Structure formats: structure tokens, C-alpha cells
């Protein structure tokens, strides 16, 4: 079978980004030893090791949706993957408010129409299980108390 490739964006500190960029544009396999990525079983934490120097990483959710588009003639572009995550290196914390481009900054706060967390469904599933495992349930919409 075929599995859709999973592309994400890696953001590095600027000096480390310059060393990684020089090693990528060089093209040797020396970069392969120099740059490693360890993703922790949290799923939202990691180390990126540039030249064997550890950097602390967080995999965050991006507010917009990006799409990689490949081409052979620079006139027709074929969509290859959807990018929604970024492993910035240096829950609410794992959500990025800004977009990658310069015009998109504070997009989630200003350029996004109010949208719901769809979280609440999981919380309701937790309450329903407790109700069904009980015997007697008493409910009242309340006031200030």
C-alpha cells in the first residue's frame, strides 16, 4: 500500500539555522551525522541535536494550513502534502498563534473568525461513564452558590 508522507517544518535558533543551512546546501552525508531528531513519548517534546549540541523542542500546531506543491515545469503544481505542525527549537502551549509568513502574525487572534475547539466531547464521555456506573442521579440547574 501507499502511506501519505508526513511533512512538518523545523524552526531552529538563527546561528544553528545558519549552520544547518550551510550543511544542507553543501550536500554531503556529513550533515546526516551532525543533525539528529529525538521525539519524546509525550508527542509534543523533543531534542534536535545540531553538531551534537542538544536543543529543546516543542511540536506545535499551526493556525493556518500549508500545502507543499511540487512542479516540473513551474507552470503546473501538484499538491504533495499538508503541513500543520512545526518543531520549534531553542494543550494551549502546543498551539502556535502566529503564521509562518510575515503578513500572518497574530492570525489566530485577529484574522480568524471566532471558532470552537472542535475536548468538550471527551469531557462529556468522561461524565457519561460515571453516570452509567452509578445508581441514583440528582440534577438541578443552579444559581449563585
Amino acid at each position: 500500500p501507499h502511506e501519505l508522507e508526513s511533512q512538518f517544518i523545523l524552526r531552529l535558533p538563527p546561528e544553528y539555522a545558519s549552520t544547518v543551512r550551510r550543511a544542507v546546501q553543501s550536500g554531503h552525508v556529513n550533515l546526516k551525522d551532525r543533525l539528529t531528531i529525538e521525539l519524546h513519548p509525550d508527542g509534543r517534546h523533543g531534542i534536535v541535536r545540531v553538531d551534537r549540541v542538544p536543543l529543546a523542542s516543542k511540536l506545535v500546531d499551526l493556525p493556518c494550513v500549508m500545502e507543499s506543491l511540487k512542479t516540473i515545469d513551474k507552470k503546473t503544481f501538484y499538491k504533495t502534502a499538508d503541513i500543520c505542525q512545526m518543531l520549534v527549537s531553542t494543550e494551549k502551549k502546543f498551539i502556535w498563534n502566529h503564521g509562518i509568513t510575515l503578513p500572518l502574525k497574530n492570525v489566530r487572534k485577529r484574522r480568524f473568525r471566532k471558532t470552537a475547539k472542535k475536548d468538550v466531547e471527551k469531557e462529556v464521555k468522561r461524565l457519561l461513564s460515571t453516570d452509567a456506573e452509578a445508581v441514583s442521579t440528582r440534577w438541578e440547574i443552579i444559581a449563585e452558590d
Binding site: D131, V135, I142
Partner: peptide
Amino acid sequence: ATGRCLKIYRTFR
């Protein structure tokens, strides 16, 4: 709209 919270009483063994 009602400014009303929800309280649930649960009985278990």
C-alpha cells in the same frame, strides 16, 4: 443566557 451552572449528585457502592 440564564447565568446558571450545572450540579450532578451521583450514588455509588
